[PDB]
């Protein structure tokens, strides 16, 4: 499972490859345009909303 | 789809004919616009040549004309009472050309009372409201009263129309095609035609 993350304020994109079920649990059973808290990704994303 | 050609029909002698070409675009047909009574809903149809047809699906008002008085007014449509082509159209309350409907009488009553200055559609109990009293019993000068009194010579209406005005609803006939132009216009029934349709309605019951 790859994640293509875009920051519009800077307009910078980055592709990150994630091999972990725990990090992807919070995204399952979600529809498009929904707001999620990306805390499970790691320690860098504390307070980020995706 | 729906085709209204002539080559699928039998010959005059009675023999059947084999077609020589398939269905063409210019021979098409479209499903009927079964116009009901309700809040206005009209759909436009792109037709041959790039023109438009207004497909009325729901209508509740239309302008009808009182021919004898030459008074055309916009009035709401209440119910469908008679249909010459089929009685199923009456049961489903479908608005088509030449169907007999019931319309409100208030604008015609207002025009009659403002023109001839005579009561119309009022009960014998003579209950009144000051606005109507000042409409009928206004203070006019000699010249204006002379015109109104002369108009009162021709102020006479048949008993059938008077009874319909007492009931509050008039019988009218639709002269436009709602499924083609999107509006339901017509005229108020009166004379021998009114008697004919009253007899038909009574015999239907």
């Amino acid at each position: 499972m790859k994640l293509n993350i875009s920051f519009p304020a800077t307009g910078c994109q980055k592709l990150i490859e994630v091999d972990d079920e725990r990090k992807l649990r919070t995204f399952y059973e979600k529809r498009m345009a929904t707001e999620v808290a990306a805390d499970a990704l790691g320690e860098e994303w504390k307070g980020y909303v995706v | 789809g729906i085709s209204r050609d002539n080559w699928h029909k039998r010959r005059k002698t009675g023999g059947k004919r084999k077609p020589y070409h398939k269905k063409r675009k210019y021979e098409l047909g479209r499903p009927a616009a079964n116009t009901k009574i309700g809040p206005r809903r009209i759909h436009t149809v792109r037709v041959r040549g790039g023109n438009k047809k207004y497909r009325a699906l729901r209508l509740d008002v239309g302008n009808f004309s009182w021919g004898s008085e030459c008074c055309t007014r916009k009035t709401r449509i209440i119910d469908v009472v008679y249909n010459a082509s089929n009685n199923e159209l009456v049961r489903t309350k479908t608005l088509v050309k030449n169907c007999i409907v019931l319309i409100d009488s208030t604008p015609y009553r207002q025009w009659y009372e403002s023109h001839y200055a005579l009561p119309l559609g009022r009960k014998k109990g003579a209950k009144l409201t000051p606005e109507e009293e000042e409409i009928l019993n206004k203070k006019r000068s000699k010249k204006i009263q002379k015109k109104y009194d002369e108009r009162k010579k021709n102020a006479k209406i048949s008993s059938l129309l008077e009874e319909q005005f007492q009931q509050g609803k008039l019988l009218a006939c639709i002269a436009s095609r709602p499924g083609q132009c999107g509006r339901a216009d017509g005229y108020v029934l009166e004379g021998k035609e009114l008697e004919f349709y009253l007899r038909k309605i009574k015999a239907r019951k």
């Binding site: - | 029909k9 005059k12 021919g67 004898s68 082509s85 021709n154 004379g191 021998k192 035609e193 349709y197």
Partner: protein, 151 residues
């Protein structure tokens, strides 16, 4: 009464019969003004059309039709449909090889107006072309002339 035989009211569309009038003019006569027209080409309007009271939208004289095209003639053979008859047209077809002719006929279904009465089988009819009135009818009866045995 006799005219009103359908579920719908039978009226001449171009005549307004609800014009209100004084009580003195109502007593005189309830005589509707008749609508009729001259069809042209030298044909005269039958007096039964002008003075009649029938309603026929396909009548050449009191209806909404236009006569343009070919003017043909025939003999009345059948009168069994409502306001339309069947006439027969006879002719000779030439065969080049034998320098001779053969007898042929055609049948036409034409519209007959109520203004024409006392029309019998075997009398001559002059018809004119109009727009298609039905699946098989394209002509309207314009003149009727009786047979040679008329007394």
């Amino acid at each position: 009464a006799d005219i009103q035989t359908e579920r719908a009211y039978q009226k001449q569309p171009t005549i307004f019969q609800n014009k209100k009038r004084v009580l003195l003019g109502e007593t005189g006569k309830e005589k509707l003004p008749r609508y009729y027209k001259n069809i042209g080409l030298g044909f005269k309007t039958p007096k039964e059309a002008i003075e009649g009271t029938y309603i026929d939208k396909k009548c050449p004289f009191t209806g909404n039709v236009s006569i343009r095209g070919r003017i043909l003639s025939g003999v009345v053979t059948k009168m069994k449909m409502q306001r339309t008859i069947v006439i027969r047209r006879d002719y000779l077809h030439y065969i080049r090889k034998y320098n001779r002719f053969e007898k042929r006929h055609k049948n036409m279904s034409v519209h007959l107006s109520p203004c024409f009465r006392d029309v019998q089988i075997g009398d001559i009819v002059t018809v004119g072309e109009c727009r298609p009135l039905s699946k098989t009818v394209r002509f309207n009866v314009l003149k009727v002339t009786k047979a040679a045995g008329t007394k």
